[PDB]
UniProtKB/Swiss-Prot annotation:
This is ABC transporter B family member 1. It is a multi-pass membrane protein. One of its GO terms (cellular component) is endoplasmic reticulum. Changing residue 39 to A: Reduced brassinolide-triggered ATPase activity and altered brassinosteroid exporter activity. It comes from Arabidopsis thaliana (Mouse-ear cress). Ubiquitous, with high levels in peduncles. Mostly localized in young developing tissues, including meristems, as well as root and shoot apices.
Length: 1165
């Protein structure tokens, strides 16, 4: 394991302004931490004066007034200190992390490629530049400030408590570890159970994704019920674990409240004892209690900052490892010859290169090549041969280990590297389009070029096409969408950027076969205008290229068999605001679906009120005890203290029990609602039709994200909302009742100021959490730009565009920096204002209590009880942070779930209408005058008045070009889609009237590219029939001939398959799909081009399956190749979305002889 760097090195990028910001933030954090208990000290002084000076009214008034002014001063100090701390720390962290990322990227680009090969790899580099960067940022921005603040709080609290009453300081210090340990155990248990629940829900989402991706087969069968069962089982596990999480949370809250109650019972009794012996005052006792508790909790809260410190030390050690690494291969040597002879006469001879990762494996064996000037040369590289390797050696990506490698007769390492890479132009198979605009991509090709050069490169170098037809034109961010560009267009953009680097030799790479001819002809015309551009990769396709290049040589085992011009080089491997009333109605709908759990809810509700009451009750007790401390009769003091302590001890157990009950029952109700919603959501999705599935915004991963997110935030927005609204209502109700019946005037004033103090305490809790936004989202654009640059480092080195990439990264990062600065300023100012208002309200209320006492309106006891009870109950109510307030997004997610459930499918998966279902289908599907138009693309309409025939005891074959919708034909066979105007007779009647599920169970199909379902081959094969037993799957395997390699598998039918399982061959998976089709034993066997996407033994297997299919009922088989359609007796025609003839191939030749398919047959020969 690598060793983390020392703490100081974290601040390597800190400049003078950063040091100033860090100092100011440290001072602010220290002042904040010290001010938290200093207020308690001032409160103790005020209370002691206001209680002792009852007889002397005027002195009491002046004392209370001066201490209220002290409260205002403390409020202002907290305002300023919190503002400075938050703003300075956040902005300094951002300012340092930005420079760190810039240096990291700059160091990364100008490294060697073999460095990425041997040492840290590109994926690790990206993972670092995201996670380690954000980790160090959060550690040095907020964690450090919080650590300083909490250490200050701890020290100041200890000092205040001890110097006030060392005795209670010692006792409370003994108390604190209990509460700290309880809180730590609670947090740890919650985190562990949260991780467990997260992984369980991830599993359930995995079932969701695998179902939605594979919806084709799922609807082809009746397996939606199976998917629902699997989802229900996963959700059952998740909900049982969820029950456990709720119980743990309830026990944690109950235990901490129990220990708090007992501990304050003991502390209050001891404080009464101390006051009785004239050791101290009541106010000093209370202040010591609170201050010592605050200090201990502050140390507890400070520890996580140390954890983050260690993690950031490791992360920054990694980052500095990449940063400090020195480029091994010397680059940009000043010995650059700067040859004026751009023509490369001779190069790449006696080349003995070996790949760095495996130096023993010598890829290139004494390679020699000429590449004469004035003429283009092509290379026939084998797949195992290093065509990319020799290209890299040309580009100087790697240095040849020995060998007489040279260029134009003047070597490579002699004449610099930047200039040489400028001389050579490269195109790549994968276009290198970064996040920036396409015009900026052209600039990245050659920054010296102006806009007119870009236009002409879009005019003469390439044709004017969609690359210009973007709505923004050339100023369009290709990275943000990507799907907008086809792939040929971005390839032509790369061609253009290469055209900018016109001079001297220009290497060419291979292009995919599935590429437009326009890009290809642009490539060859670039070749014609660039005779000095050579090394075109034929790859047995686009033979015009090999026509252009006279010198052609093949490459194998790091050597060339022949050297010279064109020859017989073929057959040697050649191949191819929003409304709220609807919110109330939908809330009623949710509650209605939550009806069965009502009992639990009711019980939970009951627990809530009791919990709330006890919280407020607790406050009152403190109040009363404080009021008792300033009483002359010490015996009456003893009686009151004993009564209150006994009552507190008695109610501690009630607090424990009712916290557990409330949380357990509320969380159980939520889990049931969540699972119930999930099931209904999945069922509604499955009832929908694929015309909705293929539509964008219905992708499998996106659907699963919808399912998870909406479910969880709905359960929050119901359960947490009800629990909060009931519990805090009861708490403030009983608190205000006590306050009113004691002194309604002071109670009314404090009720008026109540929302302010509640908001301030909520903000204190949020500050404890941290005000930093979602940094990864803020840096997302620069993040993905840097990731693309790092992954595509070869292309960046090819155009030596590291400086431009760094500049674009800086430009991307700048607006997030400014936004972060302003967000920090706003957050600091708002938090400070809230705290100042809180302390001003404290001062106002307490001074008003003094004023009431002056006029004889009330007494010290009643006023102090009212003030203390209402303020502590306000803190208890602002403890609202315990339950997550996701309601804001909860409403949107809830309208989302209701619109998804309320969405109607036009094709009913099950037809309610009566249908004349036969046991054995008549198997004579009758396509006639079909004019199907694809819904997704109304422009493309495959079918024009198509009429087809079926053969009951026989089979029909179909053949055509890849363009024709044969898979569309089989889709319309099973009512997968809906024809625009065509009509089809499956059973002497419309398919639309007859039940769809009966159609599914009566028709078996194979997909063109079948993929398997689950762990065991047994279940995947048995999927075809609802009762496959064991024998039926036996002959299903044998007739399909899958059984031989199934037995070759370790455990056969139980062998785990999938991404993590034994990944069978395409032929094997297609054959077992055939086996499943046989399992279904259906009337119509739809054997699509899977009968061609296979191998020779699978080809005889398919011929045998055709034998059985013609023997048993009927089949529609499509296969563009020959020798398979000949098996079927009757063969149809599907050319250009039209039928031309139908019958046997002998019949297809007796009338309408030859044909496009016959020409294909001659070709396949
Ligand atoms: C004198 C008060 C009215 C004062 C003005 C008030 O603002 C002050 O912040 C009060 C409400 C705080 C000061 C110390 C706090 C306590 C800190 O010490 C404790 O024992 C902790 C333990 C545990 O965290 C409890 O959940 C809260 C609990 C029990 C806190 C309850 C609220 C306080 C009692
Ligand atoms: N990242 C790599 N790690 C190890 N060996 C590599 C790497 N890249 C290429 N090679 C080796 O380089 C040789 C040729 O590269 P390879 O990727 O097999 O084919 P290619 O030159 O890209 N041609 P093709 O397969 O038709 O696309 C083989 O010996 C590879 O093992
Ligand atoms: N959702 C869709 N919306 C619009 N057009 C579609 C859709 N799905 C497929 N197509 C069209 O269907 C045609 C493809 O025909 P298809 O029968 O799927 O053969 P293929 O998959 O291209 N070749 P092959 O694998 O040999 O069967 C193209 O015109 C596609 O654009
Ligand atoms: Mg290659
Ligand atoms: Mg098709």
């Amino acid at each position: 394991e690598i060793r983390g760097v020392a703490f100081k090195e974290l601040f390597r990028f800190a400049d003078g302004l950063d040091y100033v910001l860090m100092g100011i933030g440290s001072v602010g954090a220290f002042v904040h931490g010290c001010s938290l208990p200093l207020f308690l000290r001032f409160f103790a002084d005020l209370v002691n004066s206001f209680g002792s000076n009852s007889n002397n009214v005027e002195k009491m008034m002046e004392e209370v007034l001066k201490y209220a002014l002290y409260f205002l001063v403390v409020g202002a100090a907290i305002w300023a200190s919190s503002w400075a701390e938050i703003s300075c720390w956040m902005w300094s962290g951002e300012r340092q992390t930005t420079k760190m990322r810039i240096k990291y990227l700059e160091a990364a680009l100008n490294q060697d490629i073999q460095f990425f090969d041997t040492e840290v790899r590109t994926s690790d580099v990206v993972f670092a530049i995201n996670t380690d960067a954000v980790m160090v940022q959060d550690a040095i921005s907020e964690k450090l400030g919080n650590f300083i603040h909490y250490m200050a709080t701890f020290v100041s609290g200890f000092i205040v408590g001890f110097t006030a009453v060392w005795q209670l300081a010692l006792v409370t210090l003994a108390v604190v570890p209990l509460i700290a340990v309880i809180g730590g155990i609670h947090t740890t248990t919650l985190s562990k159970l949260s991780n467990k629940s997260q992984e369980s829900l991830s599993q359930a989402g995995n079932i969701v994704e695998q179902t939605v991706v594979q919806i084709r087969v799922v609807m082809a069968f009746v397996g939606e019920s199976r998917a629902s069962q699997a989802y229900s089982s996963a959700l059952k596990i998740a909900q049982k674990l969820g029950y456990k999480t709720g119980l743990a949370k309830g026990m944690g809250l109950g235990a901490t409240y129990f220990v708090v109650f007992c501990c304050y019972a003991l502390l209050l009794w001891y404080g009464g004892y101390l006051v009785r012996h004239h050791l101290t005052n009541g106010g000093l006792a209370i202040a010591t209690m609170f201050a010592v508790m605050i200090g201990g909790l502050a140390l507890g809260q400070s520890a996580p900052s140390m954890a983050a410190f260690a993690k950031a030390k490791v992360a920054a050690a990694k980052i500095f490892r990449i940063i400090d690494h020195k480029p091994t291969i010397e680059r940009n040597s000043e010995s650059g010859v700067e040859l004026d002879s751009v023509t490369g006469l001779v190069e790449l001879k006696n080349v003995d290169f070996s790949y760095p990762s495996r130096p023993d494996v010598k890829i290139l064996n004494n390679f020699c090549l000429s590449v004469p000037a004035g003429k283009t040369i092509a290379l026939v590289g084998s797949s195992g041969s290093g065509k990319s390797t020799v290209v890299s050696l040309i580009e100087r990506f790697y240095d040849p280990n020995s060998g007489q490698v040279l260029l134009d007769g003047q070597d490579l390492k002699t004449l610099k590297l930047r200039w040489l890479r400028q001389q050579i132009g490269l195109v790549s198979q994968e276009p290198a389009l970064f996040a920036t605009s396409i015009k900026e991509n052209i600039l990245l090709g050659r920054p010296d070029a102006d806009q007119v050069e870009i236009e002409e490169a879009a005019r003469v170098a390439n044709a004017h096409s969609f690359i210009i037809k973007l709505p923004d034109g050339f100023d369009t961010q290709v990275g943000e969408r990507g799907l907008q560009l086809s792939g040929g267009q971005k390839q032509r953009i790369a061609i253009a950027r290469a055209m900018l680097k016109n001079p001297a030799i220009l290497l060419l790479d291979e292009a995919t076969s599935a590429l437009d001819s326009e890009s290809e002809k642009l490539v060859q015309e670039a070749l014609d205008r660039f005779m000095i551009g050579r090394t075109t990769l034929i790859i047995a396709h686009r033979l015009s290229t090999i026509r252009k290049a006279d010198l052609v040589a093949v490459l194998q085992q790091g050597s060339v068999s022949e050297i010279g011009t064109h020859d017989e080089l073929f057959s040697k491997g050649e191949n191819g605001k929003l409304a709220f009333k609807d919110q109330a109605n939908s809330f009623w709908r949710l509650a209605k679906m939550n009806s069965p759990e009502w009992k639990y809810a009711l019980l939970g509700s009951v627990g809530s009120v009791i919990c709330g009451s006890l919280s407020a009750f607790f406050a009152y007790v403190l109040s009363a005890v404080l009021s008792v401390y300033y009483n002359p009769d010490h015996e009456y003091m003893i009686k009151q203290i004993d009564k209150y302590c006994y009552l507190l001890i008695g109610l501690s157990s009630a607090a424990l029990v009712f916290n557990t009950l409330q949380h357990s029952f509320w969380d159980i109700v939520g889990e049931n609602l969540t699972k119930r919603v999930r099931e209904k959501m999945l069922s509604a999705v499955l009832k929908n039709e694929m015309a909705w599935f293929d539509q964008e915004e219905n992708e499998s991963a996106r659907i699963a994200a919808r399912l998870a997110l909406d479910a969880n935030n709905v359960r929050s927005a119901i359960g947490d909302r009800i629990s909060v609204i009931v519990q805090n209502t009861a708490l403030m109700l009983v608190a205000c009742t006590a306050g009113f019946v004691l002194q309604w005037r002071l109670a009314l004033v404090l009720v008026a100021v109540f929302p302010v103090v509640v908001a301030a305490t909520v903000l204190q809790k949020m500050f404890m959490t941290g005000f930093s936004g979602d940094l990864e989202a803020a840096h997302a654009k620069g993040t993905q730009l840097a990731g693309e640059a790092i992954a595509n480092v070869r292309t960046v080195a090819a155009f030596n565009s590291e400086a431009k990439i760094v500049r674009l990264y800086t430009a991307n990062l700048e607006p997030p920096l400014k936004r972060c600065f302003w967000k920090g300023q706003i957050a600091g100012s708002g938090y400070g204002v809230a705290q100042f208002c809180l302390y001003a309200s404290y001062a106002l209320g307490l001074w008003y209590a003094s004023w009431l006492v002056k006029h004889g309106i009330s007494d010290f006891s009643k006023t102090i009880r009212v003030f203390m009870v209402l303020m502590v109950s306000a803190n208890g109510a602002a403890e609202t942070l315990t339950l997550a307030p996701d309601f804001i997004k909860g409403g949107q997610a809830m309208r989302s779930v209701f619109e998804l459930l309320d969405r109607k499918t036009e094709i009913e998966p099950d037809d309610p209408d009566t249908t004349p279902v036969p046991d054995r289908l008549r198997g004579e599907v009758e396509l006639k005058h079909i004019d199907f138009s694809y819904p997704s693309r109304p422009d493309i309409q495959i079918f024009r008045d198509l009429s087809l025939r079926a053969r009951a005891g026989k089979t029909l074959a179909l053949v055509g070009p890849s363009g024709c919708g044969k898979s569309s034909v089989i889709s319309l066979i099973q009512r997968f889609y809906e024809p625009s105007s065509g009509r089809v007779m499956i059973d002497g009647k419309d398919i639309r009237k007859y039940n769809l599920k009966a159609i599914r169970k009566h028709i078996a199909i194979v997909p063109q590219e079948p993929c398997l379902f689950g762990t065991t081959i047994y279940e995947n094969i048995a999927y075809g029939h609802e009762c496959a037993t064991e024998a039926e799957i036996i002959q299903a395997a044998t007739l399909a001939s899958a059984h031989k390699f199934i037995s070759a598998l370790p455990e056969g039918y139980k062998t785990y398959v999938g991404e993590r399982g034994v990944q069978l061959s395409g032929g094997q998976k297609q054959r077992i799909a055939i086996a499943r089709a046989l399992v279904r034993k259906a009337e119509i066997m739809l054997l699509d081009e899977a009968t061609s996407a296979l191998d020779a033994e699978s080809e005889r297997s398919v011929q045998e399956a055709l034998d059985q299919a013609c023997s048993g009922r009927t089949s529609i088989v499509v296969a563009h190749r020959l020798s398979t359609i000949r098996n079927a007796h009757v063969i149809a025609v599907i050319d250009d979305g039209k039928v031309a003839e139908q019958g046997s191939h002998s019949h297809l030749l007796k009338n309408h002889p030859d044909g496009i398919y016959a020409r294909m047959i001659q070709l396949q020969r």
